[PDB]
């Protein structure tokens, strides 16, 4: 019984390690943008839209 429990736990732990290795590996892909605002109180362009 102890041997069976040990082998089952070993297999489960090995699978969990294989998963968790890549789980911790590339977890920085969550870096994205937040798109805050600044009120753009300094835009003083001219009316020359020809490019559309």
């Amino acid at each position: 019984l102890g041997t069976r429990a040990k082998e089952s736990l070993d297999l489960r732990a090995h699978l969990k390690q294989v998963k968790k290795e890549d789980i911790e590996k590339e977890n920085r892909e969550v870096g994205d943008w937040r798109k805050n605002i600044d009120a753009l109180s300094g835009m003083e362009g001219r009316k020359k839209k020809f490019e559309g």
């Binding site: 798109k35 805050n36 605002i37 009120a39 753009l40 109180s41 835009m43 003083e44």
Partner: protein, 51 residues
């Protein structure tokens, strides 16, 4: 006539000045309204995220 001449010139300059002022101020009010609306859309995005 000379009196009329000066009156006409001064009124014309004043009119053109007022027109330029109001036009540029209209552009400014457009820009500030754009600021307000785009900020409001940011507000909606933030509200959805927090909820």
């Amino acid at each position: 006539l000379k009196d009329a001449q000066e009156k006409l010139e001064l009124a014309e300059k004043k009119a053109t000045d007022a027109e330029a002022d109001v036009a540029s101020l209209n552009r400014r009010i457009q820009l500030v309204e754009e600021e307000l609306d785009r900020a409001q859309e940011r507000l909606a995005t933030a509200l959805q995220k927090l909820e």
